[PDB]
Amino acid sequence: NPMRELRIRKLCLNICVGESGDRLTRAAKVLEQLTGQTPVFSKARYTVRSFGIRRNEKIAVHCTVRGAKAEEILEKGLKVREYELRKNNFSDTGNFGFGIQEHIDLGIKYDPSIGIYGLDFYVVLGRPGFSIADKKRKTGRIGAKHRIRKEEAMRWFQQKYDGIILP
Amino acid sequence: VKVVKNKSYFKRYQVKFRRRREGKTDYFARKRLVIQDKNKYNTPKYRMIVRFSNRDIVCQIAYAKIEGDMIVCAAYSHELPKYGISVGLTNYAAAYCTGLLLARRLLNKFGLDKVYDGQVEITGDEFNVESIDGQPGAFTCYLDAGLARTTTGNKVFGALKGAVDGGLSIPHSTKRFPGYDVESKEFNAEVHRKHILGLNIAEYMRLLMEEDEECYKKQFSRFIKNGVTADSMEEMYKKAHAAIRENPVHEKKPKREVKKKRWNRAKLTLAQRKDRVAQKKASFLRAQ
Amino acid sequence: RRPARCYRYCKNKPYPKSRFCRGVPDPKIRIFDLGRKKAKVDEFPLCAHMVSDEYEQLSSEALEAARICANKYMVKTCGKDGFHIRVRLHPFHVIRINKMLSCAGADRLQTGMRGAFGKPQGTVARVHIGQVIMSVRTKAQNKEHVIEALRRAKFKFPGRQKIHVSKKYGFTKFNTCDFDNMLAEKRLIPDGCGVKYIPSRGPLSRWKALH
Amino acid sequence: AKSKNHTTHNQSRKWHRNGIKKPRSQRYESLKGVDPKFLRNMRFAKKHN
Amino acid sequence: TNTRGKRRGTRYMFARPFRKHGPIPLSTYMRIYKKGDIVDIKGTGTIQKGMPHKCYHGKTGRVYNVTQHAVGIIVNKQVKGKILAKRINVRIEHIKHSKSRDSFLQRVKENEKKKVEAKKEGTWIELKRQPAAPRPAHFVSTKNNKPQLLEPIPYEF
RNA sequence: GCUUACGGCCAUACCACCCUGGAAAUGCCCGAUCUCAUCUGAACUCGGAAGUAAAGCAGGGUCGGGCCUGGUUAGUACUUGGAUGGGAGACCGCCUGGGAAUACCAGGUGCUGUAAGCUA
RNA sequence: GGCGGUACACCUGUCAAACGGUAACGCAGGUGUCCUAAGGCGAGCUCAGGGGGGACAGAAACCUCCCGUAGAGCAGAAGGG
RNA sequence: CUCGCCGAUCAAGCAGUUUUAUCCGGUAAAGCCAAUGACUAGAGGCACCUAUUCUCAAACUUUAAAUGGGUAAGAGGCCCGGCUCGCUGGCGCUGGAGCCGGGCGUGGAAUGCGACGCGCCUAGUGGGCCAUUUUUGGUA
Ligand SMILES: [Mg+2]
Ligand SMILES: [Mg+2]
Ligand SMILES: [Mg+2]
Ligand SMILES: [Mg+2]
Ligand SMILES: [Mg+2]
Ligand SMILES: [Mg+2]
Ligand SMILES: [Mg+2]
Ligand SMILES: [Mg+2]
Ligand SMILES: [Mg+2]
Ligand SMILES: [Mg+2]
Ligand SMILES: [Mg+2]
Ligand SMILES: [Mg+2]
């Protein structure tokens, strides 16, 4: 039971701007001033003219927070959602996610030059022992009685954050 | 959604090797490491195996055979309490002593322990034992790092340093020893001697007491109850290095003849396996 | 087209319409099941075949013509929902035809046997001795009509064919003398036109679903 | 004026006319193609025994 | 005509067995091949280095030269109507020890094991192999085994 | 018997689900000062020992899938050699030898080498 | 014969009849290049595809989880690996 | 010409042949409810998805013959001792190889045959055709 504490492993967030340029590098600064760490740019897989993107160009920027800073950014991100989410936002494999339209509602002042960017919070819920699938030597599977389910992760959102899950 | 694990999936499926499915053996690295040249004709190709658990360090020397490689000599890190090291049995300093134990124990059973003493006094600098003309050649083997990422400072190179200081002729370079600066490509010796004698552990024991003595009792709980303080770290490992070079031979434990009581249950026989179905069928027919 | 006397014997290796044999015209026969094909196993117990006695290849046009000849006689004698004809020969062997060989010419890359490998002409079904051509399952009292319907369709085929009333139950692979006994033991379950064999060697949950 | 391209018709009767003789594996087979390092030491082991 | 490519027609012989792909099991690498021992030749498509030609796949020869990763074999190859002794270089992944002479060496040691018994007992047990001799005279009992009458079954179409 | 290190053969070893187990050991786990490491001490590397079976791991379970073995298929299919055998032919029979495969059915489900350790 | 074509020097699969070899203006194709890396080595990583999700964002942009014997990729034809 | 028979199937050695042993293969067949590709029909579940089903491959195959290809069936063997090495190396025996000496015929499958032995010179031919079977193009 103590080794089954449904904790959060990582809180992944990304800013998917249109294309590269001065708008992207100013969007990456939004994440490093929100997460406290330099984010990583994401290139486009293919070339799509209807989206204005081509191959091997930085069109998005993302970051990953693990420790107690992850649940702090998640707390600020759920304030914008008023501590309530839908039901379909939870995946059948445990973890869930949501979205924020304006990053100014996360505890920072708006800069007139840096336009208001929208991010995408996806928290990867976990459990002590999930690192056996990540280590190289003796990499093992989690198992059925240890992996997180959808309704099991929803009750975690209703107890830790007193959240309201809309049907 | 179409199922990917159908009958045709398992029919066409080819399982990996057992040691590969378990994630223990890298056969790409093993082929280049244990296979002897064909113009050697059973010349044993030795290798030093260094493996780490969460609580123990294993140092082994083996040569590959068709029926399974034979372990020549083996030295464990839980044998160090016999020599003085009661705690920290998985640090870089214990790896040096576990490798030094393997080097002095192998040369003892091969009868050439008087020759090839290595470095009795530790300098941390580059050292390679050389064979003396007229005397039997030095034992040459190779490092089997396994799946450990060979980064500069990995404890597999501590056991490597302990073995080359014990008299083993293992080819290596000082690039992966703790104290090799990558931007200047220079190797400093005395900083490597700190990790060997546990001086980097003593600095951590001191800064914890000067900052948060509550965190010091949590990090080094068994260090303080065993009488191992930060000021006696360097000398504790030095006494073990002297004690290992004096009595490296391992004394096996007498096997205790027991009742041979197997705990877990055995497989159900074909009669029990069929009767269980016959009972479930009868129970399903009574309910209807 | 060319008469069927020229493509009667299985002289060449099977030459199917594939990545290499491109340009094959559509076979003459495209429908292989007729009648009340959506019938249960217990509705058409009888089964009669048109067994082939010779090792030849039947053209797709002959399979289409014999299908129509057999279909029309079953409708007027047993009704449009009193039979299920299954043409059990699919034309996969593609027959070739050489060029329209003429006197001479300053083009066409040839005039005689130069580059004689021909283009795909049609499709035939290589049948073996004892291989079923057409199968008809009907009621027990329509045996005389099925034998006659298959007898008329033999004239649309070259060689020699035999009309054999099978001992199997319908289009299944189980004899009539063993069929009704296996339904009682839940070893066979009706699956569309035929039955599905259920052994006693699966998960016991599937056994409970039957009982 | 076309002719016959390739044939192995009469060849088997011509092969066995004088017989298909296996290569005579003479005693003390030659040492051509052996490892030059191996031959170098072997010639040192012969000039000293 | 055909092409003279070195691997024309080797679609199935150099392929690996079904569900036997992947890395070569390392016991094949740690087999010692001395000089003069009988070895088979079975090329493998996994190791594209030191492959024997398709004419040697399935042939058997003796080793004359041993190297780091390979072995020199003296193989017989019939070209048209003459058999020639070919010295080919094949890596050890494409060869294996031939059990052809193992039955002979087993009989040699067994012949020397049974004739020294004659020098110590005084017998003349024959050591030569003999073809399958005609079956000796035997009695076939019908005590609990009565001859069952068989008859050809009628025809059924 | 069990736990590890290195393995050999490379599913009888895999896959799904369920149950049981911590003596030693293993694993999870506790931390980021040092070595090192990344967007992130998750991983990698390093330091450690508060908890002890949730997972890994091991051992069981499933008229389990797969796999393995055998039977059946079947002396069937095919095939060496033979005839001044049959038949318009297509093809077929016989003689002389060799001899399959699926469906189906049944059983089984890792074995083992070297080294170290422990009798829940 | 000429015209056409190149079966003229090569390569893959098949033909080819389970060693190898085996023809036709047989069949389906490829070649006269390309690459300072697309060569060499070491380390880390896992692909194709599908599914659950997640501001703008949709059948396709990016993040994330699960499944995934390779069904992707490996300059090119095809086969093998 | 070298021999063998002469001078005891002395024995070797050899074989378009078997026997024994050991490998090699992917054709016939078979299979596709196994992969790739082709293809028919219903049925179940919330166009697909699952379980079945009809019919196929020369450039498909899990499987897999018959016939066939290679190799081995001894003194050039087997066993033992000593010696040499600059190669190899914990270990002048650790490998390995070479050299030397000694011991042991019950020549250690069947059948046949003098060795189709070792050379030298060499004409003619280099348009073939036919049959059983196998087989490609073609209506033939
Ligand atoms: Mg001419
Ligand atoms: Mg010609
Ligand atoms: Mg000619
Ligand atoms: Mg070709
Ligand atoms: Mg070539
Ligand atoms: Mg190469
Ligand atoms: Mg448990
Ligand atoms: Mg089963
Ligand atoms: Mg030429
Ligand atoms: Mg052949
Ligand atoms: Mg001449
Ligand atoms: Mg001439």
mmCIF file of C-alpha atoms in Angstrom, chain B residues 30-216:
data_model
loop_
_atom_site.group_PDB
_atom_site.id
_atom_site.type_symbol
_atom_site.label_atom_id
_atom_site.label_comp_id
_atom_site.label_asym_id
_atom_site.label_seq_id
_atom_site.Cartn_x
_atom_site.Cartn_y
_atom_site.Cartn_z
ATOM 1 C CA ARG B 30 30.055 -10.332 -25.766
ATOM 2 C CA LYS B 31 30.951 -11.622 -29.235
ATOM 3 C CA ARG B 32 33.846 -9.169 -29.543
ATOM 4 C CA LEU B 33 34.940 -9.736 -25.926
ATOM 5 C CA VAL B 34 34.897 -13.474 -25.140
ATOM 6 C CA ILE B 35 35.560 -15.013 -28.571
ATOM 7 C CA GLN B 36 39.187 -16.089 -28.943
ATOM 8 C CA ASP B 37 41.079 -15.981 -32.226
ATOM 9 C CA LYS B 38 40.901 -19.260 -34.118
ATOM 10 C CA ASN B 39 44.698 -19.464 -34.432
ATOM 11 C CA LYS B 40 44.912 -19.704 -30.624
ATOM 12 C CA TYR B 41 43.405 -23.216 -30.296
ATOM 13 C CA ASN B 42 41.815 -23.129 -26.823
ATOM 14 C CA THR B 43 44.077 -20.394 -25.472
ATOM 15 C CA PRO B 44 41.919 -19.048 -22.612
ATOM 16 C CA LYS B 45 40.724 -15.486 -23.210
ATOM 17 C CA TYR B 46 40.121 -14.135 -19.722
ATOM 18 C CA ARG B 47 37.910 -11.184 -18.837
ATOM 19 C CA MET B 48 37.178 -9.289 -15.628
ATOM 20 C CA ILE B 49 33.451 -9.052 -14.917
ATOM 21 C CA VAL B 50 32.317 -6.118 -12.765
ATOM 22 C CA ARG B 51 28.622 -6.002 -11.855
ATOM 23 C CA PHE B 52 26.743 -3.794 -9.394
ATOM 24 C CA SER B 53 23.581 -4.488 -7.434
ATOM 25 C CA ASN B 54 21.809 -2.056 -5.118
ATOM 26 C CA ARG B 55 23.882 -3.346 -2.183
ATOM 27 C CA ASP B 56 26.820 -5.382 -3.521
ATOM 28 C CA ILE B 57 29.718 -5.260 -5.979
ATOM 29 C CA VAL B 58 30.685 -8.417 -7.883
ATOM 30 C CA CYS B 59 34.119 -8.908 -9.455
ATOM 31 C CA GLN B 60 34.686 -12.096 -11.449
ATOM 32 C CA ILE B 61 37.243 -13.501 -13.882
ATOM 33 C CA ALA B 62 36.120 -16.045 -16.471
ATOM 34 C CA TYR B 63 36.946 -17.534 -19.858
ATOM 35 C CA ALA B 64 34.307 -18.533 -22.393
ATOM 36 C CA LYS B 65 33.507 -22.199 -23.019
ATOM 37 C CA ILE B 66 30.853 -23.890 -25.137
ATOM 38 C CA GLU B 67 29.040 -25.363 -22.125
ATOM 39 C CA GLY B 68 29.152 -22.016 -20.312
ATOM 40 C CA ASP B 69 32.065 -19.819 -19.282
ATOM 41 C CA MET B 70 34.002 -21.052 -16.255
ATOM 42 C CA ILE B 71 34.510 -18.649 -13.351
ATOM 43 C CA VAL B 72 38.178 -18.736 -12.355
ATOM 44 C CA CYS B 73 38.138 -16.315 -9.416
ATOM 45 C CA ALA B 74 35.414 -14.217 -7.809
ATOM 46 C CA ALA B 75 35.578 -11.450 -5.204
ATOM 47 C CA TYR B 76 32.470 -9.879 -3.679
ATOM 48 C CA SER B 77 32.032 -6.596 -1.839
ATOM 49 C CA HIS B 78 30.330 -8.289 1.123
ATOM 50 C CA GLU B 79 33.694 -9.924 1.903
ATOM 51 C CA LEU B 80 35.107 -6.502 2.881
ATOM 52 C CA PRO B 81 33.731 -6.552 6.485
ATOM 53 C CA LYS B 82 36.290 -9.315 6.981
ATOM 54 C CA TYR B 83 38.976 -6.726 6.162
ATOM 55 C CA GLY B 84 37.540 -3.718 8.005
ATOM 56 C CA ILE B 85 35.144 -2.056 5.551
ATOM 57 C CA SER B 86 31.827 -2.467 7.374
ATOM 58 C CA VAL B 87 29.808 0.217 5.546
ATOM 59 C CA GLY B 88 29.797 1.781 2.101
ATOM 60 C CA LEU B 89 30.080 -1.598 0.382
ATOM 61 C CA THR B 90 28.958 -0.165 -2.974
ATOM 62 C CA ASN B 91 30.969 3.056 -3.387
ATOM 63 C CA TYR B 92 33.931 3.765 -5.659
ATOM 64 C CA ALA B 93 36.270 3.000 -2.756
ATOM 65 C CA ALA B 94 34.645 -0.395 -2.189
ATOM 66 C CA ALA B 95 34.923 -1.089 -5.921
ATOM 67 C CA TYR B 96 38.680 -0.510 -5.748
ATOM 68 C CA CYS B 97 38.933 -2.874 -2.776
ATOM 69 C CA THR B 98 36.692 -5.461 -4.440
ATOM 70 C CA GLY B 99 38.872 -5.277 -7.544
ATOM 71 C CA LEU B 100 42.038 -5.360 -5.448
ATOM 72 C CA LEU B 101 40.656 -8.415 -3.653
ATOM 73 C CA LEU B 102 40.046 -10.139 -6.993
ATOM 74 C CA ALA B 103 43.554 -9.290 -8.202
ATOM 75 C CA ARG B 104 45.374 -10.533 -5.096
ATOM 76 C CA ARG B 105 43.155 -13.613 -4.788
ATOM 77 C CA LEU B 106 43.744 -14.686 -8.395
ATOM 78 C CA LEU B 107 47.521 -14.278 -8.180
ATOM 79 C CA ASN B 108 47.473 -16.245 -4.917
ATOM 80 C CA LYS B 109 45.909 -19.390 -6.392
ATOM 81 C CA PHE B 110 48.062 -19.166 -9.536
ATOM 82 C CA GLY B 111 51.208 -19.189 -7.391
ATOM 83 C CA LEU B 112 52.531 -15.866 -8.725
ATOM 84 C CA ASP B 113 51.331 -13.642 -5.882
ATOM 85 C CA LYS B 114 54.915 -12.909 -4.816
ATOM 86 C CA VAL B 115 55.531 -11.533 -8.310
ATOM 87 C CA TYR B 116 53.539 -8.626 -9.773
ATOM 88 C CA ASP B 117 52.632 -6.800 -6.572
ATOM 89 C CA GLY B 118 51.378 -3.791 -8.535
ATOM 90 C CA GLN B 119 51.217 -0.527 -6.598
ATOM 91 C CA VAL B 120 51.279 -1.167 -2.855
ATOM 92 C CA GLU B 121 51.148 2.587 -2.234
ATOM 93 C CA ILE B 122 48.345 4.308 -4.136
ATOM 94 C CA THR B 123 49.265 7.223 -6.396
ATOM 95 C CA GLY B 124 46.142 7.391 -8.578
ATOM 96 C CA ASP B 125 48.224 7.939 -11.722
ATOM 97 C CA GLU B 126 48.520 5.622 -14.719
ATOM 98 C CA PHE B 127 50.010 2.235 -13.839
ATOM 99 C CA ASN B 128 50.427 -0.892 -15.964
ATOM 100 C CA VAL B 129 52.125 -4.006 -14.611
ATOM 101 C CA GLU B 130 54.861 -5.384 -16.866
ATOM 102 C CA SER B 131 56.011 -8.987 -17.159
ATOM 103 C CA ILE B 132 59.511 -9.739 -15.885
ATOM 104 C CA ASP B 133 61.745 -11.725 -18.226
ATOM 105 C CA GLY B 134 62.454 -15.193 -16.869
ATOM 106 C CA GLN B 135 59.443 -15.000 -14.543
ATOM 107 C CA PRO B 136 55.980 -16.250 -15.544
ATOM 108 C CA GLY B 137 54.077 -13.693 -17.569
ATOM 109 C CA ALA B 138 51.587 -11.410 -15.878
ATOM 110 C CA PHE B 139 47.928 -12.400 -15.932
ATOM 111 C CA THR B 140 46.212 -10.484 -18.740
ATOM 112 C CA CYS B 141 42.433 -10.077 -18.906
ATOM 113 C CA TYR B 142 39.892 -7.512 -20.084
ATOM 114 C CA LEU B 143 37.146 -5.418 -18.522
ATOM 115 C CA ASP B 144 33.581 -6.658 -19.060
ATOM 116 C CA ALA B 145 31.607 -3.505 -18.286
ATOM 117 C CA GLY B 146 28.322 -5.141 -19.288
ATOM 118 C CA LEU B 147 25.409 -2.750 -19.722
ATOM 119 C CA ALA B 148 27.009 -0.020 -17.592
ATOM 120 C CA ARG B 149 27.468 3.255 -19.464
ATOM 121 C CA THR B 150 31.251 3.725 -19.483
ATOM 122 C CA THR B 151 31.284 7.358 -18.407
ATOM 123 C CA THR B 152 34.291 9.013 -16.790
ATOM 124 C CA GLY B 153 33.941 8.105 -13.115
ATOM 125 C CA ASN B 154 31.944 4.876 -13.376
ATOM 126 C CA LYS B 155 32.696 2.446 -10.559
ATOM 127 C CA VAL B 156 33.504 -0.305 -13.081
ATOM 128 C CA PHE B 157 36.777 1.578 -13.563
ATOM 129 C CA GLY B 158 37.322 1.611 -9.809
ATOM 130 C CA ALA B 159 37.352 -2.181 -9.808
ATOM 131 C CA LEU B 160 39.481 -1.892 -12.945
ATOM 132 C CA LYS B 161 41.922 0.361 -11.088
ATOM 133 C CA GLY B 162 41.944 -1.986 -8.098
ATOM 134 C CA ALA B 163 42.819 -4.955 -10.300
ATOM 135 C CA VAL B 164 45.621 -3.265 -12.247
ATOM 136 C CA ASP B 165 47.080 -2.174 -8.902
ATOM 137 C CA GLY B 166 46.845 -5.744 -7.601
ATOM 138 C CA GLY B 167 48.982 -7.170 -10.393
ATOM 139 C CA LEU B 168 46.564 -7.779 -13.259
ATOM 140 C CA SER B 169 47.589 -6.691 -16.764
ATOM 141 C CA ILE B 170 44.349 -5.193 -18.080
ATOM 142 C CA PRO B 171 44.664 -2.738 -21.000
ATOM 143 C CA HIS B 172 42.973 0.594 -20.331
ATOM 144 C CA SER B 173 43.513 4.350 -20.274
ATOM 145 C CA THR B 174 42.971 7.073 -17.687
ATOM 146 C CA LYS B 175 40.185 8.730 -19.701
ATOM 147 C CA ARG B 176 37.347 7.133 -17.708
ATOM 148 C CA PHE B 177 38.906 7.501 -14.264
ATOM 149 C CA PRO B 178 37.343 10.095 -11.934
ATOM 150 C CA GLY B 179 39.506 13.169 -12.364
ATOM 151 C CA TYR B 180 39.866 13.238 -16.139
ATOM 152 C CA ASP B 181 38.940 16.705 -17.394
ATOM 153 C CA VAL B 182 37.267 16.497 -20.794
ATOM 154 C CA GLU B 183 37.791 20.103 -21.922
ATOM 155 C CA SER B 184 41.540 19.955 -21.188
ATOM 156 C CA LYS B 185 41.985 16.199 -21.943
ATOM 157 C CA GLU B 186 44.390 16.030 -18.984
ATOM 158 C CA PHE B 187 44.226 13.460 -16.187
ATOM 159 C CA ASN B 188 45.015 14.524 -12.623
ATOM 160 C CA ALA B 189 46.191 11.750 -10.314
ATOM 161 C CA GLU B 190 45.565 12.999 -6.768
ATOM 162 C CA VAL B 191 41.895 13.738 -7.474
ATOM 163 C CA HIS B 192 41.548 10.109 -8.578
ATOM 164 C CA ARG B 193 43.217 9.005 -5.337
ATOM 165 C CA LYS B 194 40.447 10.811 -3.440
ATOM 166 C CA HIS B 195 37.710 8.614 -4.917
ATOM 167 C CA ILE B 196 39.904 5.541 -4.379
ATOM 168 C CA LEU B 197 40.463 6.186 -0.665
ATOM 169 C CA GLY B 198 36.972 7.618 -0.173
ATOM 170 C CA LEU B 199 38.109 11.204 0.371
ATOM 171 C CA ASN B 200 35.149 12.384 -1.714
ATOM 172 C CA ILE B 201 32.951 10.583 0.818
ATOM 173 C CA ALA B 202 34.611 12.311 3.780
ATOM 174 C CA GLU B 203 33.970 15.733 2.243
ATOM 175 C CA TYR B 204 30.266 14.872 2.010
ATOM 176 C CA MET B 205 30.174 13.665 5.619
ATOM 177 C CA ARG B 206 31.722 16.955 6.755
ATOM 178 C CA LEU B 207 29.563 19.376 4.763
ATOM 179 C CA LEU B 208 26.405 17.616 5.972
ATOM 180 C CA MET B 209 27.352 18.118 9.625
ATOM 181 C CA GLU B 210 28.187 21.780 8.957
ATOM 182 C CA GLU B 211 24.865 22.439 7.171
ATOM 183 C CA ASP B 212 22.159 20.060 8.442
ATOM 184 C CA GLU B 213 23.143 17.493 11.069
ATOM 185 C CA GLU B 214 19.659 15.982 10.760
ATOM 186 C CA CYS B 215 20.325 15.156 7.103
ATOM 187 C CA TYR B 216 23.743 13.760 8.053
#
